[PDB]
């Protein structure tokens, strides 16, 4: 790694706070920039459908996500998305960089380690969020 390691882009923290306090977004997808020096915003969404969220997860690549998980309650959920079929290089750098983003985000209720689509299903996440 570099001397300072990966940084969190200002836009990423801004987007997170806008979601957390303003409900500006339903979810945010974060990723490493191509230089692998910063965690940036890949995409935001206001789509209320959980399926719309799942359909944006790359089947063979990694990302991080924050989801405003709503049910009947609104809980901030952090996802690490690291599918089994992603390249080893990618899995490793996303694992090594995760702490930089995760430690920068205050107010996450639940963390999900997503390695397949069963682990990130709405029902699986609801079970996690509602227990703890």
Swiss-Prot record:
Keywords: Actin-binding, Cytoplasm, Cytoskeleton, Nucleus, Phosphoprotein. It holds the Pfam family Cofilin_ADF. Controls reversibly actin polymerization and depolymerization in a pH-sensitive manner. It has the ability to bind G- and F-actin in a 1:1 ratio of cofilin to actin. Binding to F-actin is regulated by tropomyosin. It is the major component of intranuclear and cytoplasmic actin rods. Required for accumulation of actin at the cell division site via depolymerizing actin at the cell ends. In association with myosin II has a role in the assembly of the contractile ring via severing actin filaments. Involved in the maintenance of the contractile ring once formed. Residues 5-130 form the ADF-H domain. It is found in: Cytoplasm; Cytoplasm, Cytoskeleton; Nucleus matrix. CDD domains: ADF_cofilin_like (cd11286). Gene3D superfamilies: Severin. PROSITE patterns: ADF_H (PS51263). It comes from Saccharomyces cerevisiae (strain ATCC 204508 / S288c). GO terms for molecular function: actin filament binding. Interacts with actin and AIP1 in a ternary complex. The N-terminus is blocked. Present with 19600 molecules/cell in log phase SD medium. GO terms for cellular component: actin cortical patch; actin cytoskeleton; cytoplasm; nuclear matrix; plasma membrane. Belongs to the actin-binding proteins ADF family. The modification Phosphoserine is found at residue 4. GO terms for biological process: actin filament depolymerization; actin filament organization; actin filament severing; endocytosis; Golgi to plasma membrane protein transport. This is Cofilin. Disulfide bonds: none annotated.
